[PDB]
């Protein structure tokens, strides 16, 4: 009868959870959260993610990769990360937060934009070789990211917390890409216009814990995945159980290793 | 869909003074169809009533005097209820229930037998007031589960909500047989006591609450009415049923417990 909730994108290894991660994780189980997809940002926390993956086996699923922001990412940042990913290739659910961030502060220079582009292209190629999906960031770079993903022939893709127009998002739905919705949708008008247009067959749930919570500058936790489910249910004029059943089914399609690893 | 009801919360609390409208707009987006705002002291009755006018049909007001007073805490007095009575009488027709009444037999506040009887008398009068105005009671029962449930039975209370019942399931079963309702706050995911409670508790007797700003998923972290889905999620998993079944039944139970609700929405 009852179905579980999947957090397709979160940062459990973040310094914000160092103090109470186990209490947070036990409470998430009680809050009907069946699986957590833990993503990486830098190579320095890959061991910590793989350690959480072993301690909470079948509940915390790992993702390793180098994020566009580190300062903009460099090829040198990806070089350090490649031997570690290769060592855990069989244990990963996806390539853990890769993408582009064309924010004025981080990437203003054309060289910085190409460095990001190069680091993403290699990780799309790495993912294709290891037969793994990509868990993607695209802040202020929605069309650049989607085009690059199409060009590189990415099959299983998650566009997490899509900070872009619905016309750009429609390019992704046609490309067969998935979109995760964080609980910050209840305070964000941009995320509101997005879900409106987005078909439920292409929607997944995320928190992006410790970020993108219901309140700005207040720590976000994986149990807030129900807030996302509630917002989508009301906006789509359907049952919350329908949202929970379809988004969890979408998570199983997007991440093919999930059904077995759960 | 059906919508979620927060059967017990403190929107008038000083914790919400800065961003209440942002909190309430955010709660609407989070599929919260109704909020039942309760009182603690007469000094915030005007604030609760003004809020219910501003958010008409969404914020449902409850007025009453809580067993604990002050903000160093002390036990309630008959004088505290006397100041309240003229204000409740002025808003009798606009209220959904008598707003957080009950007993608190914590060692710090009601140690003395006289303090325990002062609380008992303040509650008894409010049950009498509620019976006259034909209103339900929204009840507190910290460390006084059986004393509250017996007193309510003795006084012949018809529509009762035992909010965040902190007592044993055997004591709670006395309430279900008496036809009383029990609201569950999102602190259930961190509280073992409330975990054994819902286990035994029939869903036909369960309601949802947050008790905002208190009893959140995290201790010493502000609780907001959108956390009512966390409560619904916990109950669904434990009962091995659909979250929509919990949302539909608890809202239906809220409409039975509060007879003015269907009309006031
Ligand atoms: Ni927190
Ligand atoms: Ni807060
Ligand atoms: Zn991101
Ligand atoms: Zn992220
Ligand atoms: Zn209380
Ligand atoms: Zn209360």
Curated annotation (Swiss-Prot), chain A:
Protein name as it appears in the record: Deoxyribonuclease TATDN3
Function: Exhibits 3'-exonuclease activities and apurinic/apyrimidinic (AP) endonuclease (in vitro). Show preferential AP endonuclease activity on double-stranded DNA substrates and 3'- exonuclease activity on single-stranded DNA.
EC number: 3.1.11.-, 3.1.21.-
Membrane as UniProt keyword: no
Top-level taxon in the UniProt lineage: Eukaryota
Keyword Metal-binding recorded: yes
Binding-site residues for Zn(2+) 1, renumbered to this chain: 9, 11, 97, 208
GO cellular component: mitochondrion; nucleus
Main location: nucleus
Binding, Zn(2+) 2: 97, 137, 160
A matching Pfam family: TatD_DNase
InterPro entries given in the database record: Metal_Hydrolase, TatD-like
Coiled-coil spans in chain: none
Higher taxonomy: Eukaryota, Metazoa, Chordata, Craniata, Vertebrata
Regulation of activity: The 3'-exonuclease activity is sensitive to the metal ion present in the active site, whereas the AP endodeoxyribonuclease activity is observed in a variety of divalent metal cofactors. 3'-exoxonuclease activity is suppressed in the presence of Ca(2+), Zn(2+) and Ni(2+).
Record's subcellular location: Nucleus
Keywords (A to Z) from UniProt: Endonuclease, Hydrolase, Metal-binding, Nuclease, Nucleus, Zinc
Family designation: Belongs to the metallo-dependent hydrolases superfamily. TatD-type hydrolase family.
Result of changing residue 97 to A: Reduces AP endodeoxyribonuclease and 3'-exonuclease activities
Cofactor dependency: Mn(2+); Ca(2+); Mg(2+); Zn(2+)
Cofactor binding annotation: Binds 2 Zn(2+) per subunit. Exhibits AP endonuclease and 3'-exonuclease activities in the presence of Mg(2+) and Mn(2+). In contrast, in the presence of Ca(2+), shows AP endonuclease activity exclusively.
Single GO MF descriptor: nuclease activity
Enzyme class: hydrolase
Source organism per UniProt: Homo sapiens
